[PDB]
Amino acid sequence: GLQRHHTSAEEAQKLEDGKINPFTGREFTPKYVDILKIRRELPVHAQRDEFLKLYQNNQIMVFVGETGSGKTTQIPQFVLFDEMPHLENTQVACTQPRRVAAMSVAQRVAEEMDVKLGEEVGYSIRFENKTSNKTILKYMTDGMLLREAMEDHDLSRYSCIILDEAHERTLATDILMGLLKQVVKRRPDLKIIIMSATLDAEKFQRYFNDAPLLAVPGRTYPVELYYTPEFQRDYLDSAIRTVLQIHATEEAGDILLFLTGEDEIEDAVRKISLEGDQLVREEGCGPLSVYPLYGSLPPHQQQRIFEPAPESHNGRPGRKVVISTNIAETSLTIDGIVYVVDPGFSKQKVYNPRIRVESLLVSPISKASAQQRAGRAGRTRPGKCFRLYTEEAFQKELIEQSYPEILRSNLSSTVLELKKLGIDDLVHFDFMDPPAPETMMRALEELNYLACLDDEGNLTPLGRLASQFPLDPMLAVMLIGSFEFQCSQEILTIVAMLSVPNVFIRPTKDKKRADDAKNIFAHPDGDHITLLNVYHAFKSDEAYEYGIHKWCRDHYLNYRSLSAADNIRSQLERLMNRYNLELNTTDYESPKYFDNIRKALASGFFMQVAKKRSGGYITVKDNQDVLIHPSTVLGHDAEWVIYNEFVLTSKNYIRTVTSVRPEWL
């Protein structure tokens, strides 16, 4: 009758059309029949038989296909039909890097199989676990699956694990690949499927021991390209004008607009809606609906982007505009897009090795990203892609390809997270794109020195507790230990201020004015108490009365950095309350307030101490000849100083310095 891991495409197709739903035993709805008719035309259904032949004689396979081929919403169904999980109490997990994609695809698959969402097919996001004991298919964020692996190393509850959007090369995806390549050895019945959108995936095959590859033939129409003849100063106004022009003159077909973030998206939505209403009023053009799309949208708002374009009423075509943000690129596909507007800027994560801070900064996209954005333009008819930059910029300004997130993030937090999963041979761990051995060794050494990893290399309670926080383990350990010195709140503030980009702007011109503005806050003991003073003066009601933006601009302060610092401080306070960690403070008027703060601060930065040379300073670690930075507030000789940042120029410098008495070290 039905054989596990031995079915065929014909048997599955025949069982699909049966009047009885195999997974639940209820009656099929006509909606399911119509959806099946619509979705049977996708490219993957043609190769279904080849995929079945491949999935039975191998454990790991690579399935590469152009976006829109129907991989995330179809392949899991093929696996379900070939596996019959409900007869063995096992599930199938598909990992989506993006939360919005996971939720939307889960809802779509629930609709397709004619089963209520949350019963058979569900999703699992952080703080949102929409699933039950009857779930057979689960769409989960890669972070959530990593957490589950942390709880259950062997993943004994899953029979098949599908890694979607493997070309994004996020950190969680890389760790998951590295872990599964080894987990497969223990479990003979586990079956992996790596799915990618790049039609060239030779290196994936090489990494997975020459795993078989299956390619979906390209089905994208030609798309013309357009550029501007000069550089664009303001790209948001240019994007608005381009969208309005496209709606006014071009033919019928929806528009896709890529922007940076939530606030920009909302402002663009409002502006475009107002301009469209004015255009309809004055020129009598067709209606133009607007839908936003970003990470935090609720599902009832996410589902709106798929609604059909409004019917025309002015004798000209109606249109639908989706103001997306690097989610329409490859995560999900919208049917009906013919025109694409590509400002060229996207929000990317960057890491600063010297300060050890991760920030989300708007930077230009790579050539691959621009090519994918253009390709999104044509899938139904020959489309057009309008780029808001010069062709010379595209051919010279952009970078060939972006780097994997493993090389663009702290390598110590990554090690501390890997140790949670139970890995032992970190140096011999097989990463997709290994970092240089020097940095890995340095990270391991630093972690051992902080007591996060004991001499045996195993995790310790302090290590786990520090891992819970979103900070560099040094600052996390200092935060945990600060409660003993009766100055916990001050250290919390200082850590929050130190975990963000520099809050001072020091241009070449007006430098003396900036120095005076800093000295307004400066305390003649170190540059660390200065950050505390700046934060205290930032939230003072006097500043709010004066005007927060004006006050920040006048005093040469970075408002964005201080807002980020306040957000991080609130998050840290919440997290500290969560784990029941002692918090306290010393009265301001007490003479030992600064003594307490410096005592707690020296116990955390003991790894970075410099001594005043006889004669400017010599570091205790690595014995580097350095000079206090000119932008400093040190008052006295400061025989022993604590430095946070290292500045490399013709003459070495140390920045953010503060004094400390020898007895405290």
Partner: peptide
Amino acid sequence: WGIHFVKGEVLASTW
């Protein structure tokens, strides 16, 4: 309106 464009290259069909 207010933006003018210059035609560029064409991406051939992948069929």
